[model samples]
Target: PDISAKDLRNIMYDHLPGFGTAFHQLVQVICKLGKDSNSLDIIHAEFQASLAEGDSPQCALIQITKRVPIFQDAAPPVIHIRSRGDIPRACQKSLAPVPPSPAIDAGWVCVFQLQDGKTLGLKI
Candidate 1:
């Protein structure tokens, strides 16, 4: 059943019965553990990185710096801007607003890129 965006919006749970109750609960769970795990053959490609105490904050910075160009002139770089922090049990801080799946749970901050582009400007 190919759901058209227009029709989906128009219907918007009009005919669905006992779906919102289940759907919302499902989204909550999916969002909490929405990590991308891929495997090829028997390789068992499983990778995981998390922010523990002093890890998550640091990793966020590393991602931003790595994107810098090597050919750029020696310019004074500054952490000129900061938006928000990962406050546990708090709302999703500018993370991917991906239809809040059930995985999000009550507290989960999907590591978002600061100074990231409009997509991540949820700070304001």
Candidate 2:
């Protein structure tokens, strides 16, 4: 028992841009897993904070990945660029805040299709 799916979806979209239905469903699954661990409160808070910022796909992704420890080490999230638009390889500057090299674009989002909780196969 935790936040309703409707509420969770709202929060996820509110925070995540470029994140489409696929990622949203993944979020629901993550939330459910967190509920089982009795960490839904913390997870929800993080989700809200992830949205609080402006449109930063990287930030939102990092937020979710970081908060969920499993994603950090085990999953080792991969950015599967469907097209050139998915990965932002622009060269704004070598040392800019948003490094142009291999920068993620707005057209793409993250995903996971894993059978076990310990593993995740995500695309960017």
Candidate 3:
């Protein structure tokens, strides 16, 4: 039972498409599923990371989709975008790094709702 809720999500999120460490760190939980499981997970992105130097956010997304097993067995992760200035832009590009496209604008936030009602979010 060493697998904490944080542990499980860390694995899944690593598999999550377009998961960028520079943009988002691990998730923040308001609650978990009965404290015995990670199903139906919930999280927030007041939560934050910025992208790595010379890394591409779009490319990172593409990389995970290819090798992350969960995506192969399930529908693509559903992401919802919100313009919240309160959240941090977790993934700010470094010099010569590829900036997030217009959609994930400066100070924009993104929430990824997982298949089992779990959630992962990115805050700028």
Candidate 4:
């Protein structure tokens, strides 16, 4: 099932800790964007605008990329990275595995690996 705006709002409420005032505004803007449109560029512009001074645009882009997918119907592909050498190689292999009627589609793919045996994921 697709995620509804209410679901997003509930999730935001549940994870309200550690967010600065400006960050909360960013989250609200993202929730509205998720409800009103599917354009990443619009979201990107809002992300750039929502930050406090001196905040990194790259970090905001990362945040936007990750949260925007919550509104998408399909989840991104996830690739397991086994070694340091596999990082660059994994991109080419992202499309290799085609299962019958793959489920959970989205706009971005993720590559993850173990860091001290804990999974660390990066969106691509």
lDDT values for all models = 0.25, 0.44, 0.34, 0.44
Error of 2 at 73 (Å): 3.5
Comparing 2 and 4 on lDDT, the stronger one: 4
Q: How does residue 56 of candidate 2 score in lDDT?
A: 60
TM-scores for candidates 1 onward, in order:
0.16, 0.43, 0.25, 0.30
User: Per-residue lDDT for 1-124 in model 3, tens only?
Assistant: 3345566456446544564443333222211321333232221111111134333443443333333333232222235434333233444332122233412323223345445554444433
**Candidates by TM-score, descending order:** 2, 4, 3, 1
Of 1 and 4, the candidate ranking higher by lDDT: 4
lDDT of 1 at 12: 24
Per residue, candidate 2 scores C-alpha lDDT tens digits across 8-99 of: 55666665545443455346445555555565666667766765766363455446655665343322223333343333322111112221
Model 4 CA deviation exceeding 4 Å by range: 1-37, 50-52, 65-76, 80-84, 88-109, 112-120
Tens digits of lDDT, candidate 1, 1-124:
1333233322323322343232322222222222111111111111012122333322322321222232112111112234434322233332343233312222222323346532221111
Q: How well does candidate 1 match the true structure in TM-score terms?
A: 0.16
Q: For all candidates, what are the clash counts?
A: 15, 2, 13, 5
Instruction: For residues 1-124, write the lDDT of model 4, one tens digit per residue.
Output: 1556566545544544443222333344455655666554555454546455444543454456455655444433444556545544433333333333332322233333434343333322
Sort by lDDT, best first. Answer: 4, 2, 3, 1
Model 2 residue 71 CA deviation (Å) reads 4.0
Model 3 TM-score, 2 decimals: 0.25
